[PDB]
Design a protein around this ligand. Structure first.
Ligand SMILES: COc1cc(OC)c2nc(C)cc(N)c2c1
Lengths: 535, 542, 539
């Protein structure tokens, strides 16, 4: 019966003519560099007569042993966060360069690349050293994959350099960015003694009778707008393949100090749970007589026999078992509060708790919490302490114990986007992109970001206008092209940020609009490597 | 720097250049994300949204994403959304032109096509904000906050991006979406005012797509696979697909039919959707009634219930079954009781018994003086995913010679209606496989037979999905660039048909799951030709 | 409507908006399963594939019926049980072998295939250590697992398929001893299990009925592996004439041990999971609540009563122990040398008890046992991967295993054949320097694992190996780029030298034997003139 279901020319899908390729030989080449210092710059010169092509740059980084006292840990993906800039240049000048946060953005979907850059509990959990000669973190090496457009189709897209001298340059962020630390930590010494120790590897190709043809290249150019200004403009846009827009926070009006940090565990729930844990130290107190050692502005109340404390309309159920007879259960009813006028709405972190149950330990003399019912969110965990106690706040603001406040952590991670530590909250309410002075694209919802995430299979997308839907390398990229006489040589982005009540500390986080334009360049090989901005 | 060992190993042959490419110039186009509001009709009385795409400068399109605004939910009761709510709103999608339907899919088959796309799934609505069962306490309590979800209508026009795009230059395309009843996409208890909710709820859709404006487009015809689904009669282990002339694939699976029930269940895990999560939720709900600490016999259980005091050694023997219960810090005036027949089923008056209490072996915990409740520490049990998937109706069916549901009234109050339209198998995780043998017949000849789900193994293996189906794939030829390889269900030897026969596993007449009715679903992908002569038109290959 | 600015912004050109749908070869695929012949020393299954209507095949999937396991004791299956059953696979024709792979290399090839791994057996039903209580109690239910025998014939689906038109193909599978795939305690009757156990396999594949097939030759990579002698940091691969890649890794050798370990996490295979199972097993003896000094421990044990202070000092190391709700007639004791190792008396000591910082918990009056709340410790993956044998080694001047007899009874034999490194997660990297010589000249040397970094990076796998990849050319459509021999200059061999990093002679892990593994992928030419044959390229 099958013989029934089975004249004309047909393409063979059961055999292929195995073509003989170019004769080449690859080699993983590692090379130490020159480190020079203001900011730290590593330079790697690649000049070898027998290296014909290269791609897949990996910068390795040896992190020191960290000994002393205080709490200290590394930002996630520390390797990528070390990099402020990378430039690939020849004797004819720059071939390609990228900003560190955009390199991170391009590799943010490479899970293996991310893990190699430094993502472990050994690196990213906040360790604590107890003696001035105690070891906080052990020495370690991380690997940063410098993704470049020369890796896209491997040998085909490789950087050709036969009889050219190419120099890879890495500018490093201040070590302050890649470190999360306590006050007790001697950052002053650390900053002083720490140096970047880098080494650049690449896959080099020795090619016999190489046939060089020109190619095309995309270079992301980044523009940051002014603080709290909701627009940014990219000039000299003649051949752009895509345009991405995102917001980033500006923490310069603060001390960059936050109450809680989860460590290696970076899920939204983890960020929340760590916060709740730090708050719970002061939120529920078991003591003999009214608790001591809180600001006078604190309003710590004894829990009634019903177990319910009413903070305005908010009811909080607190039940601790095995409390000593001489002790009572107290609730800090305004652990953190913010208000801009005396007759305003008030943001009170204690009101975000509904139920706190646990058990007192006679042996260890502390409370062990069992079930916490609350409505703490990712934003609460991302509020700089400074904002709780800003001049705008008519209250004291920070009513924590000094013991709690001491454990606050400085975080200066340079790649934060949004207003929360997970980039969860979307604060762009409307988006308008103008090419010249005409509106090119507008949206009320984040449909450009939905398509971004959808089209790239990523959970970390951005509002992105992609103009190239053409397979890269085998075709000249499709671009939005400029008319210079009509004035269309600029891309202006303007947003309308989403509105919220002025009595939330997060309202006072300063915002910066980031616009990234991918310009098309042509890579030429007449008398060395050279690039040319398509116009 | 390059080792000299390499330099030596490196004349007279033609070689392909593998270090450079000749960049071809592509068709001149410009893409644009276009969104569209639509026309809403509640006559079909189902709700239907229609979107017309007619623009001279839109030459081609692909990647349809339908957005949906979910409202604020205020009131009293427990309420939540099924996971991937957006996909569960869709009962049907049709893409049609002036010459008629070009492509249409059933809502459940769109979902099946998108199950390995985790991003498409997250976008459709998957969060603890959306899918955890929230509770309102006052008639003005907010249960759910308003939200927008985006559902990716995967089409054959997305497969090869611009190449597979639907060309429509000089045609008017209409996308029509039929919506399932909102009852399907909602999980709620009895306290919730669904009657009002259902009345006030409206679907608010908006269709986006990637539009392509092409200069001097050179249009060529292509081919399209259309999934056609057939559902067999209730509890019948056969289904037949007719008019099969050019099938690229054939998929088989089962669905439960809960129409003989109220669709109410004892427990639901919420956002956490792991098999372990479904079980843990169930055990948690039972434990409220399974072990009681009271002064004197517990009260407010049916007279049918058999609550026993736990002996000093901790062991209650329920027939052949032993259950170890030890609760710490019990008051002196109180005792520890075990509900020994929380849920039980039997078909004859003194025969075998399926009794949920007997599936626990160990229960330990500590009584809390402050909260006047027991906190469990470790539960050893043998509850499975099937137990968590039994409609309550079946516990109290006429077929049951016992009372059946001997839980407290308080427990029964927390039961939840679940009407998710895309359930497969007989449990909520589609874990239990009830097909023992599968046969596909074209006429009297067998085309394929299997004892294990090796067709599903190949399915998941070849498509990198952890959620596959028993699938006979006939086309292994690269799509879009080749005409798909198809099987024909003959034409001359009578009718042109594929009939599927399965052998269901045999199950106990005293387990409730026996009475969950099952339906066999067969899905056939027919090959169609998409022609663009004088507008877009399709033709079933025959 | 396209926004107005776009419509304004818009030579030979390639069409990217329609394509010429070509008519492919006329074929018909069929999922074929095949029971085989079973042969026994080693267990061998054979499958012959000869059919008038099967022209080509690819995607071999081996089925495995696991029996019901009834009886008493603790028993479980290694993760990816299906892959761990396979000791060798060979595909051969009347002209001889076409392709063959060792079980561990097939596994390595699929280790980033999450579905293939899941299909082979990765579940709590399979990989959690269940316990049987009655001689007729069910420990494990019957189950089927599916093993994807990835071959070079799957790279490009129909294009790379093995053509067998008018040939008899034989797939042969050699099975490891079932001892390898099972994790069990002493109470389990392995003796009966092993006698009654049989491998029940079935080979499936995708077959193609092809009308007028036009066969052309192809190329194939065959992974050949060389294992070095125990603890030897060199190995050599001879007759290297056209290699596409070269990989190096380490394995432990547990022949000096009974293959018994104190703890196993079960299905939960995260490194933290391994540690928690260990710490959990230790805590049974580590903190004891009894009326008067604990009983039933070796006389060698040093159990001390915990002071009212709560701090017990074991040499420089302090251990804070506080258990709530301890009965009045009972005290809290700390076992201060649960496991200890030393090679000389009055020397350094490796003491597992000194690795705990804090132990808090609460005693249960109802169940007469302690429930631990918080453990501060520094147990690491290595501690969890030490054979019990090594604690009670002749090298040890101490007793070593001062655990209760109850504890020691619960220890589990593990004989998983694909363990890498010296710890159960391959976490510790013990190669400090790597040198590869082609002939006698140095081809590659590295001081960090940059070759592994690149391996993982280029293959999107988090389980890579130090690997020298020579072929960066797309498979199937091109002849693979190879490193080529100069047999004339002696350059027909690949020699690997490592410098293992050394460890403290007072840690038990120093005494775990290690083996160097080298895997060479040789290029062969597949021709189909008068049946299928392969030919080793000798450029
Ligand atoms: C869209 O870009 C393509 C498409 C293809 O098929 C239509 C290709 N096919 C082969 C064999 C090789 C390629 N580089 C290739 C690239």
């Amino acid at each position: 019966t099958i013989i029934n279901s089975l004249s004309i020319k047909r393409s063979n899908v059961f055999a292929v003519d195995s073509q003989i390729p170019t004769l080449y030989m690859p080699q993983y080449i590692s090379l130490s560099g020159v480190m020079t210092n203001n900011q730290a710059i590593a330079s790697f010169e690649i000049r070898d007569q027998y290296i014909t092509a290269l791609n897949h740059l990996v910068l390795s980084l040896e992190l020191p042993e960290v000994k002393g006292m205080g709490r200290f840990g590394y930002v996630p993906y520390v390797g990528y966060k070390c990099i402020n800039h990378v430039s690939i240049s020849s004797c004819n000048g720059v071939i390609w360069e990228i900003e560190g946060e955009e390199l991170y953005n391009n590799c943010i979907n490479n899970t293996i690349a991310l893990k190699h850059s430094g993502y472990s509990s050994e690196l990213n959990d906040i360790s604590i050293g107890l003696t001035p000669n105690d070891t906080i973190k052990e020495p370690s090496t991380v690997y940063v994959y410098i993704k470049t457009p020369f890796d896209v189709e491997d040998t085909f897209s490789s950087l050709k350099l036969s009889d050219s001298k190419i120099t890879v340059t890495v500018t490093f962020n201040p070590v302050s960015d890649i470190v999360i630390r306590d006050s007790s930590f001697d950052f002053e010494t650390f900053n002083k003694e720490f140096v970047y120790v880098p080494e650049l590897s690449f896959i080099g190709y020795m090619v016999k009778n190489v046939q060089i043809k020109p190619s095309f290249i995309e270079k992301p150019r980044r523009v940051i707008g002014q603080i709290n200004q909701p627009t940014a403009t990219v000039t000299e846009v003649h051949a752009a393949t895509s345009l991405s827009v995102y917001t980033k926070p500006y923490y310069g009006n603060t001390d960059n100090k936050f109450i809680s940090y989860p460590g290696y565990s970076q899920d939204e729930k983890d960020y929340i749970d760590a916060y709740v844990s730090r708050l719970l130290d002061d939120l529920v107190i078991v003591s003999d007589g009214p608790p001591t050692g809180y600001p006078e502005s604190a309003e710590i109340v004894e829990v009634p026999e019903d177990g319910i404390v009413s903070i305005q309309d908010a009811d909080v159920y607190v039940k601790i078992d095995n409390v000593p007879d001489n002790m009572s259960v107290y609730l800090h009813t305004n652990l953190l509060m913010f208000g801009t006028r005396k007759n305003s709405f008030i943001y009170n972190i204690s009101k975000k708790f509904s139920a706190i149950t646990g058990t007192y330990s006679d042996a260890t003399k502390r409370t062990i919490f069992a079930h916490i019912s609350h409505s703490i969110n990712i934003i609460d965990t991302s509020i700089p302490v400074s904002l709780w106690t800003s001049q705008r706040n008519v209250y004291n603001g920070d009513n924590r114990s000094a013991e709690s406040k001491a454990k606050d952590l400085f975080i200066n991670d340079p790649f934060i986007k949004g207003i929360d530590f997970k980039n969860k909250t979307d604060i762009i309410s409307r988006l308008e992109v103008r090419f010249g002075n005409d509106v090119l694209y507008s949206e009320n919802g984040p449909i450009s970001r939905i398509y971004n995430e959808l089209l790239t299979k990523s959970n970390n997308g951005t509002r992105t206008l992609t103009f190239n839907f053409t397979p890269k390398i085998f075709f000249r990229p499709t671009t939005i092209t400029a008319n210079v006489s009509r004035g269309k040589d600029k891309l202006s982005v303007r947003v309308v940020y989403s509105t919220m009540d002025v009595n939330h500390p997060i309202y006072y986080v300063q915002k910066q609009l980031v616009v990234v334009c991918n310009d098309l360049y042509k890579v030429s090989y007449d008398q060395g490597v050279s690039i040319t901005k398509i116009m």
